């Protein structure tokens, strides 16, 4: 329904978060299928890192676009 200038910014990263959930779930499943390799452990760290990076980047975006105009509305007078 309604969406401001922050909701769309948040949803901009939502196209990759779902993809990365699917990919990391497959990573866990294929690790369960066979764990006798460090390649999957390395891919696991490569993918969980990208997950944390997406989440932290989205949090930073919403925080900075909060503070971009919190100060402007503070001196809105």
């Amino acid at each position: 329904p309604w969406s401001g200038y922050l909701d769309d910014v948040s949803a901009k990263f939502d196209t990759g978060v779902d993809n990365l959930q699917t990919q990391v779930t497959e990573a866990l499943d294929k690790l369960a299928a066979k764990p006798s390799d460090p390649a999957l452990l390395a891919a696991y760290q490569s993918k969980l890192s990208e997950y944390n990076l997406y989440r932290n980047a989205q949090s930073n975006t919403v925080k900075v676009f909060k503070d971009i105009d919190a100060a402007i509305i503070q001196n809105f007078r």
Partner: protein
């Protein structure tokens, strides 16, 4: 698409790997050590099975007792029970079956002869490699025939050659056991940083910045 249950699925995945990957290997080494201990009993029984003869190079060697004992050990180790199976690591009660693909994938890393796969009626199981014991038990029959009422008569040189072959077979069994034990560094060493999947809990708990 959830993160609350991803930690639970991580925990259950770690639990399933322990009893499907580590517990299996523990049962393998346990049953194989039991096998080696039984064989050590058999070898210890060998001491009271020799008799000097001719006051020279001849030593009577008991073959009927060795044949019977090794045949009995094979018979008790050719069936399927909790003390004969190494995969799929039977425990508690009953006998569990396994598929062909996983049996092959286990034989590829266990380095065992293919003459070990047998069917427990419904499915398939992996058993201890009995080929060295078989080869030894038909080779000991190659020293002659038990014409005497008690045991074979045989000079020292053939006894030395036979004992050298015997000890070579036993060092092969011992190095097999050494490989299985050294697979600690192949299983626990990588499990120690495979348990680091808990980063999916800790590193996904620093995301509180999403809720400030």
């Amino acid at each position: 698409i959830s993160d609350a249950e991803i930690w639970d699925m991580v925990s259950q995945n770690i639990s399933a790997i322990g009893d499907s990957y580590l517990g299996v290997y523990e049962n393998v080494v346990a049953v194989y050590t039991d096998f080696y201990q039984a064989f050590s009993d058999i070898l210890s029984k060998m001491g009271g099975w020799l008799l000097p003869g001719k006051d020279g190079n001849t030593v009577k060697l008991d073959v009927t007792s060795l044949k019977n004992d090794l045949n009995s050990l094979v018979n008790k180790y050719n069936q399927i029970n909790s003390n004969t199976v190494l995969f799929p690591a039977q425990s508690g009660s009953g006998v569990k079956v396994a598929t062909e693909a996983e049996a092959r994938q286990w034989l590829s890393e266990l380095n065992l002869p293919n003459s070990c796969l047998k069917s427990y009626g419904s499915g398939y199981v992996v058993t201890v490699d009995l080929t060295p014991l078989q080869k030894m038990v038909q080779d000991i029959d190659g020293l002659g025939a038990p014409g005497k009422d008690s045991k074979l008569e045989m000079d020292n040189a053939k006894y030395q050659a036979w004992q050298s072959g015997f000890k070579a077979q036993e060092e092969n069994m011992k190095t097999t056991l050494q490989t299985l034990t050294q697979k600690y560094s192949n299983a626990n060493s990588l499990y120690d940083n495979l348990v680091k999947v808990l980063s999916s809990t800790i590193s996904s708990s620093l995301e509180t910045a999403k809720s400030f």
